A and B are shown apart, each in its own frame.
Chain A
């Protein structure tokens, strides 16, 4: 188990769910809402 943890950490692949943007549908480019 310890060697499995060390292999994942070194060649780092983690199975955590990642924080996605809440407006990925309507704003897919992710533009910034200020001066353009």
Chain B
């Protein structure tokens, strides 16, 4: 019951996620690991890879005033801080809900602003490891952040927001694009200007200067427009010279110069690249007179261009350690030392033990690859209908044969003896090539999606588009049987080492196990959330497990199954794209899995409540009156130092706090709580009622609990002494408040009577005739009995 573990992972330079950094090293993002290359020699320096995390990394930032510390933002919402000296994560920050997308650092590097796709921007302290605060604007996702202190951000709702940081609320907003979306932000390093790139190819230009009045900081000084009308991915400024680079996700990067805003900014140069660039970045090398623009493409490459300031040359490139588009097939050697990977545009064969590429060929498209025994030559069936043949040791192309006319070779299987190969195509036929010379063909009803042989070369099995499988005999091609019951067409199949089992992977999201004597389905087992691409048995039963098989599907999963006990024994995660191909070793000890990820991998009490609030307010009143006496003596520094509950509730007055704790309780509970209150607690309540009536708020509640206090303690008040003083104060204050409120409402009702009579006088009638029958609210009021 031996499981599988990730041991190796390779075949990848920069992913389609954003944010390349330069340091003469290029620090880019592979899927979950952030890896740093030399650009001069193609050997990577290091990889930063964490065992606790699996989510993909999508934002990189270099700290200023201290390189060899970096901030990476992942897909789950976490941030890690790495070192380039030692490849560990010193601190981790789990603050956001989803998908960190833009990082930013302070000038001093003690403060870190991270804006997500869940639209929160959270700023982080780097000496206390506490989430400082959470700035909250922005209808949808934030696409630009910068530290000006002050913060300047821009979001996908086309708003630039200028936030303060001493008082954590926004000072300014402006709307960059009227009906579009502001997509990128670029700040001048001296904070004089900011240009924001919008959806139409329009670049808006803003000038920056360096509360009760009209505050005006950002000014739309003009609009610019670039050449290509795409959603612009980034705007990067030169840290030293007067240039910037604007690019969308396309094959052009437009470098403009800093000398109307159209007179201020002119395009210096337009750089064409071989692939769609995802993120450009700036590089300045010590001792050169140039501009080292480092582009990182979506098509799996880094390019360093030299731009002459006062044309482009493809100066440096990193393409050897990765396939450039997308791996469609893998086929690993009989000696299991090297493997071949077949991608659209290329063949690249690799060593397992060193995980470094050895040979490279160019083909048009590469559906299916498999080498011939002796591992000297390889076979590739392409989309255009042909079968190409290459060889490893001399690294060349031997032969090419138009197998089918324009119909893609969907299946290639080498004979287990090793003298023939079979190509099943997108035409109806499936052809046999003996070595290569065409020996026998097989015409069948529909397009053959996948065919495989038997390990003892006895029976063949094609798998059509008609959602069916035809198992034939190998010697003469007579129909042995056919397997049915698939709702959607069969994508793959693999049959057992003794030919007593077939697994059959379909597009209806399940795999089937057939017995291959009588072809009875053993058990249809629904095991993947999407259409299962491929299946493979481990070939050797030397280890006692030959009836186990792997299945790889579009839901980013491999699954290790047991066909004897019909049970999933392991679930293999770790791929971030739809896994297209996989293969197992001939020893079966490891397997390779090649994805849409472009990364091929190798696997081995109410009254007591108001009473304590009364006491809190009483201590607050004593501290405030002592602070009044101190500030009356001298204007020296005197802190009141009130309760942390008050400075956490927000420096409210004790009157407001005790009013809220009297307001929260329902009226019957208020009656019971004031009844349960003792006469030691009564005088504090009477002082706070004096405070309410003085600073009038909830006068009916104040009078209600005051008359309840007097009526439930009338004898004790008229026997005590200090109640005379505080009750005289509350009498004067309450009588003034009641007389003020009553006189205001009396003036209101008298004015409403006057204006109502005047409006009646306006309304009465104009004409006079014989019929004064022209000169009332009515309600309905149903009642059941």
Q: Is the CB of A27 within 8 A of B784?
A: yes
Residue numbers in B under 8 Å from A34 (CB-CB): 781-782
Q: Which residue of B lies closest to A27 (CB)?
A: B784
The docked-state distance in angstroms from the alpha carbon of A36 to that of B784 is 12
Closest chain-A Cβ to B276's Cβ sits at a distance in Å of: 54
A12 vs B447: C-alpha distance when bound (angstroms): 50
B780 interface contact, C-beta 8 A:
yes
Residues of A within 8 A of B780 (CB): 35-36
User: Does the CB pair A33–B779 fall under 8 Å?
Assistant: no
Chain B residues within an 8 Å CB radius of A33: 782-784
Contact with A along B744-785 (1 / 0, CB 8 A): 000000000000000000000000000000000001111110
CB distance from B510 to the nearest CB of A (A): 27
Contacts of A15 in B (CB 8 A): none
CB contact list, A1-36 vs B, under 8 A: 23, 27, 31-36
With a CB–CB cut-off of 8 A, which chain B residues contact A23? 784
Give B780's nearest chain A residue, CB to CB. A36
In the complex, the chain A residue whose C-beta lies closest to that of B783 is A33
Q: Is the interface of A mostly helix, strand, loop or mixed?
A: loop
Task: Give how many A-B residue pairs fall within 8 Å (CB-CB).
Answer: 17
C-alpha spacing A14/B781, complex, angstroms:
39
What CA separation (Å) do A26 and B734 show in the bound complex?
Answer: 56
Q: How far is the CA of A27 from the CA of B782 in the complex (A)?
A: 12
Nearest residue (CB) in B for A26 is B784
Q: Which residues of A contact B782 (CB under 8 A)?
A: 31-36
Q: Which residue of B lies closest to A31 (CB)?
A: B782
Chain A contacts for B783, CB-based, 8 A: 33
Determine the distance from Cα of A2 to Cα of B58 in the docked complex, in whole angstroms: 54
Within 8 A of A (CB), among B341-359: none
A31 to B783, CA, bound (A): 9
Name the A residues within 8 Å of B784 (CB-CB). 23, 27, 31, 33
Please name all residues of chain B whose beta carbon is closer than 8 Å to the beta carbon of A35 when the two chains form the complex. Answer: 779-782
Q: Which residues from chain A contact B779 at a C-beta distance below 8 Å?
A: 35
Q: Which residue of chain B is the closest to A33 with respect to CB atoms? A: B784
| Chain B residue at smallest Cβ distance from A36 | B780
Chain B residues, Cβ within 8 Å of A32: 782
- CB neighbours of B781 from chain A (8 A): 34-36
CB A26 to nearest CB in B, in angstroms, measures 9
Q: Which chain B residues lie closer than 8 Å to A27 at the CB level?
A: 784
CB distance from A1 to the nearest CB of B (A): 33
Complex alpha-carbon distance, A12 and B392, angstroms: 70
A31 vs B782: C-alpha distance when bound (angstroms): 8
Bound-state Cα–Cα, A33 to B784, Å: 6
Nearest Cβ distance between residue B598 and chain A, in whole angstroms? 48
Q: How far is the CB of B255 from chain A (nearest CB, A)?
A: 68
Please name the residue on chain B nearest to A34 by beta carbon: B782
Q: State in angstroms the CA–CA spacing of A23 and B780 once bound together.
A: 21
Cα A31 to Cα B779 with chains together (Å): 16
> In angstroms, how far is the closest chain A Cβ from the Cβ of B781?
7
Give the complex CA separation of A21 and B780 in angstroms. 24
Q: How far is the CA of A34 from the CA of B779 in the complex (A)?
A: 10
How far is it, in angstroms, between the C-alpha of A34 and the C-alpha of B782 when the chains are bound?
Answer: 5
Q: Give the CA-CA distance A27 to B783 in the complex, in Å.
A: 11
B785 to chain A, nearest CB (A): 8
Closest chain A CB from B487 CB (angstroms) = 27
Q: From residue B667, how far is it (CB to closest CB) to chain A in Å?
A: 25
Q: Which residues of B contact A36 (CB under 8 A)?
A: 780-782
Complex alpha-carbon distance, A2 and B76, angstroms: 45
Q: How far is the CA of A3 from the CA of B780 in the complex (A)?
A: 54
The CA-CA distance from A30 to B784 in the complex, in Å, is: 9
Separation of A27 and B784 alpha carbons in the complex (Å): 8
A23 to B783, CA, bound (A): 13
- Closest Cβ of chain B to A33, distance in Å, is 4
Most buried by A among B780, B783, B784: B784
A25 to chain B, nearest CB (A): 12
User: Shortest distance in angstroms between B695's beta carbon and chain A's nearest beta carbon?
Assistant: 40
Nearest-neighbour CB distance to chain A for B780, whole angstroms, equals 4
Complex Cα–Cα for A34 and B780 (A) = 8
CB distance from A16 to the nearest CB of B (A): 27
> Once the chains are docked, how many angstroms separate the CA of A23 from the CA of B782?
15
Rounded to whole Å, the gap between the CB of B779 and the closest CB of chain A is: 7
Output the least CB separation between A35 and chain B (Å): 6
Cα distance A17–B781 in the bound complex, in angstroms: 34
CA distance A36 to B781 in the complex (A): 6
Q: What is the CB-to-nearest-CB distance from A14 to chain B, in angstroms, rounded to a whole number?
A: 30
| A17 and B782 alpha carbons, distance in the complex (Å) | 31
Closest CB of chain B to A23's CB: distance in Å?
A: 7
How far apart sit A34 and B781, CA to CA, in the bound complex (Å)? 5
A35 to B780, CA, bound (A): 6
Assembly CA distance A36 to B779 (angstroms): 8
Nearest-neighbour CB distance to chain A for B784, whole angstroms, equals 4
Q: Render B110-148 as a binary contact track against A, CB cut-off 8 A, 1 for contact.
A: 000000000000000000000000000000000000000
CA distance A34 to B783 in the complex (A): 7
Which residues of B lie under 8 Å from residue A31 when comparing CB positions?
Answer: 782, 784
Which residues of B664-681 have CB atoms within 8 Å of chain A's CB atoms?
A: none
Least CB separation from A32: chain B residue: B782
C-alpha spacing A23/B784, complex, angstroms: 9
Can you name the residue of chain B whose Cβ is closest to the Cβ of A23? B784
How many angstroms from the CA of A33 to the CA of B785 in the assembled complex?
9
Quote the shortest CB–CB distance from B57 to chain A (angstroms). 47
Bound CA–CA A32/B780 (angstroms): 12
A27 CB to nearest chain B CB (Å): 6
CB distance from A21 to the nearest CB of B (A): 11
Least CB distance from A7 to B in Å reads 26
CA of A32 to CA of B784 in the docked complex: distance in angstroms? Answer: 8
Q: Which residue of A lies closest to B779 (CB)?
A: A35
CB distance from A24 to the nearest CB of B (A): 12
In the bound complex, CA of A10 to CA of B783 (Å): 42
**Separation of A36 and B778 alpha carbons in the complex (Å):** 11
Mark out the residues of chain B between 524 and 555 whose CB falls within 8 Å of any chain A CB in the assembled complex. none
B511: shortest Cβ distance to chain A, in Å? 31
In the complex, what distance in Å separates the CA atom of A35 from the CA atom of B781? 5
Q: Bound complex: CA of A24 vs CA of B352, how far in Å?
A: 84
Residue in chain A with minimal CB distance to B784: A33
User: When chains A and B are docked, how far (Å) is the Cα of A1 from the Cα of B75?
Assistant: 51
Q: For the complex, give the distance between the alpha carbons of A27 and B602 in Å.
A: 78
Residues of B581-639 at the interface with A, using a CB-CB cut-off of 8 Å, are none
How far apart are the CA atoms of A35 and B778 in the complex, in Å?
11
Shortest distance from the beta carbon of A32 to any chain B beta carbon, whole Å: 7
Q: Write the nearest CB–CB distance from B256 to chain A, whole angstroms.
A: 68
CA distance A17 to B780 in the complex (A): 36
A-B contacts, 17 listed (Cβ < 8 Å): A23-B784, A27-B784, A31-B782, A31-B784, A32-B782, A33-B782, A33-B783, A33-B784, A34-B781, A34-B782, A35-B779, A35-B780, A35-B781, A35-B782, A36-B780, A36-B781, A36-B782
**What 5 A-B pairs are tightest by C-beta distance, nearest first?**
A36-B780, A33-B784, A36-B782, A33-B783, A33-B782
**Can you name 7 extra interface pairs (CB under 8 A) apart from A31-B784, A33-B783?**
A23-B784, A27-B784, A32-B782, A33-B782, A34-B781, A35-B782, A36-B781
Q: Which residues of A contact B (CB under 8 A)?
A: 23, 27, 31-36
